[PDB]
Design a protein around this ligand. Structure first.
Ligand code: BYU
Length: 298
């Protein structure tokens, strides 16, 4: 290709060993990288690599270039998936990002649900599941801090959801795909994903009905994500098909308070779903409110 060389970010492609596919449409693969830190040139790390497939158009190339450049602009934060390097010279375009070992937050939560109540005899910690209330609040706090950072860089996510938050080996939350092209003028609202998700159920009403996105549209989505956290990966608006969702949103319907969820947290959810965007909290306010809950842990 004739892509310009950016020495700040270029990484030698022969220091990558490509491995297992992580997603395909182009594709993302898991890889081992050697010397991502130039101070440790022989040290291995595990990364995710985005690339085009042989079919790709000039438009697909421009889209991946745009995604690479937006990640350079937005800069680094602990609670987002960060750009690590690019391979633009002498070979196919690769964009290399952090790889979160524990997968996405929806699956992380669902896999850590306590078992059913009559499966096995009681034991020393049978009343404890893996996930405690302060760790659930911390997950929410970390996503709010990531979104506050992205907002400060003028980034509207437009699909914020537990499936788009990834979990590291140390249980750090990292927002995924914040610079991904989302084709907002051609959304199939009835679309169900391969894993059963109906992404329309995370859209703020002004985005769904009026095609308007602001940072306060992402606050609505954050409220849905808070509900996913405190249902340990539940699916929003259970038992409501998309046709009925349209009708219920026009009537002001909101999800019920989940079980085992304190009123402080359902309170925050309902603030995030206030009809008027200006009457929803900001991400700065959400960070502060969740910080106070964390500091009140015994
Ligand atoms: C790190 C080891 C591993 O296998 N992790 C793993 C296994 C299963 C499932 C997941 C989610 C993960 N962790 C991931 C996955 C991805 C990923 C998966 C599919 C598509 N994209 C991405 N990452 C990605 C990419 Cl490649 C770009 O490219 C520009 C931008 C992104 O957001 C900014 C993201 Cl999230 N990524 C990290 N960990």
């Amino acid at each position: 290709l004739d892509l310009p060389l950016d020495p700040l970010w270029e990484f030698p492609r022969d220091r990558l060993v490509l491995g297992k596919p992580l997603g395909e449409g182009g594709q993302v693969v898991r890889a081992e990288a050697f010397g991502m830190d130039p101070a440790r040139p022989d040290q291995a790390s595990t990364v995710a690599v985005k690339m085009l497939k042989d079919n790709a158009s000039d438009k697909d190339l421009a889209d991946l270039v745009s995604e690479m450049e937006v990640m350079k602009l937005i800069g680094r934060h602990k609670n987002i998936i960060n750009l690590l390097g690019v391979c633009t010279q002498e070979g196919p375009l690769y964009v290399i990002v952090e790889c979160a070992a524990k997968g996405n937050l929806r699956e992380f939560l669902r896999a850590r649900r306590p078992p059913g109540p009559d499966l096995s005899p009681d034991g020393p910690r049978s009343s404890e599941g893996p996930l405690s209330f302060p760790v659930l609040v911390s997950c929410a706090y970390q996503v709010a801090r990531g979104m506050q950072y992205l907002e400060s860089r003028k980034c509207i996510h437009r699909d914020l959801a537990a499936r788009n938050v990834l979990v590291t080996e140390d249980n750090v939350m990292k927002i995924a795909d914040f610079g991904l092209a989302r084709g907002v003028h051609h959304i199939d609202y009835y679309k169900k994903t391969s894993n059963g998700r109906l992404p329309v159920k995370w859209m703020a009403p002004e985005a769904l009905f009026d095609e308007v996105y602001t940072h306060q549209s992402d606050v609505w989505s954050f409220g849905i994500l808070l509900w996913e956290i405190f249902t340990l990966g539940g699916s929003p608006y259970p038992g409501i098909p998309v046709e009925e969702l349209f009708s219920l949103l026009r009537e002001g319907h909101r999800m019920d308070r989940p079980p085992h969820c304190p009123p402080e947290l359902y309170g925050l959810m309902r603030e995030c779903w206030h009809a008027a965007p200006s009457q929803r909290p900001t991400f700065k306010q959400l960070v502060e409110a969740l910080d106070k809950v964390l500091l009140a842990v015994s």
